[PDB]
């Protein structure tokens, strides 16, 4: 195997590293996996389809302009180069290799397109038409953005967009399911908590956070239990950043944020799908859980879950490992059909006051076709009133003792609107047996005399009842 000769490939430290602080992509390339036959679409502000490092892989069938309602996602050029982000993300996935231009994509033989959707008013309809673009041609969708990362917003897909997620994972990709890769957010400096973003908090999105070059949690990172894994991105000014294609046929060394992590993950997922085109959308999440690596990622919240895997709210299961992903994909056995066990927990509304604990012992649909002994995602769907939402912190503890933070205190969130059946999701109990006692904790983290009521708590378990591995 000959590594790429591109002039900035040596600067792509998160791929070309020899120091074990990389995504282990060369190992996948050397196994023969470069993305051939896979199609990825960037949902963003457009794609410079004539960029010298993108044209050779550009796919019009992976592209659309839902802002102007035409097929051509070319960005709108402005003095400030506002609409450059999709082009940066596209190059991360699939910049051409060995062509003397810039660097290379993770999946440098994949086909790449873009949906121009962010350069205009983003409505539910715009979102749905983007998520649902050509779902039997595009394999993987990469989205780096969501509701405002101001640390006070709670929002997610409205009805059309939610329908697009369920149509995508159910009928997309020949019934195997569209793979939606999502950035978990850039709201760290606002103390944002990413389960309040219903796109990344979705079970249908494979959610990705960031680590700095030196292995730290970047200033912009949001912690939450819905995140699955991590890719490298930017950090402080002594740490390197992402090197990729830029607007106006240029090359940037200063692509940043969690919004630069999701495209790298999408590229690794493209390599993985080349290794096994029969992987379902759930299979892909299983592979990520099993192969991601905590080593050398620094966080104070690494915890071992009930099946022996280390998990963090900053990093999920750790750094994506492309070589391990493609290796495990090859002989992967398709997971069983997804079961869903719905448990209405409360017998009466509960005053929250300063602190509320709700304990319930469940059988996880014992005796029914939705019996789950092997959890995937778990949700606590909560309806509650409270006078100042961001003073709340919420935790969910599984029968195996795994404490998922569903919501951290958000100091900017002054809302009096509470949560209306908000489906806080955790990945941290993946593969655990969910039978037994679950504990929900809601706490007022402020000294204020805050008040409200929990009126509904639905525990929703997803998973199967077969195929478990020995704990790690
Ligand atoms: C009731 C009803 O109709 N509500 C419609 C709402 C429409 C907006 N949306 C959240 C949202 C917003 C925005 C716009 N940003 C937020 C604030 N800053 C800059 C602009 C973008 C997304 C979004 C981004 C990507 Cl890359 C893919 C998808 Cl699929 C989406 C998502 C929530 C629902
Ligand atoms: C894909 O997986 C399904 C489910 O296990 C199986 O029935 C089918 O034969 C597989 N197809 C290929 C081409 O491997
Ligand atoms: Ca256009
Ligand atoms: Ca190149
Ligand atoms: Ca956020
Ligand atoms: Cl469902
Ligand atoms: Na975001
Ligand atoms: Na997700
Ligand atoms: Na534990
Ligand atoms: Na149990």
Residue numbers in the entry: 110 to 581
Article excerpt on this structure:
The PCs catalyze the posttranslational maturation of many proproteins thereby contributing to a variety of physiological processes. Furin and six additional PCs (PC1, PC2, PC4, PACE4, PC5, and PC7) cleave their substrates after multibasic sequences and, therefore, are often named as basic PCs.
In all complexes, the central dichlorobiphenyl-segment occupied a hydrophobic pocket in a similar manner, as described for furin in complex with various dichlorophenylpyridine-derived inhibitors. , This cryptic binding pocket was opened after a flip of the side chain of the furin residue Trp254 by approximately 180° and lined by the hydrophobic side chains of furin residues Leu152, Met226, Leu227, Val231, Leu240, Ala252 and Trp291. Binding modes could be also determined for the asymmetric inhibitors 13, 26, 27, and 41. The electron densities of the central biphenyl core and the structurally similar left arms of inhibitors 13 and 26 were well-defined. The trifluoroacetamide and acetamide groups were involved in two identical water mediated polar contacts between their amide NH and the carboxyl group of Asp264 and its carbonyl oxygen to the backbone NH of Asp233. In contrast, in both structures a sufficient electron density could be only obtained for the first ring D of the right inhibitor arm. This suggests a high flexibility of the terminal ring E in these inhibitors. The bound conformation of both inhibitors was nearly identical.
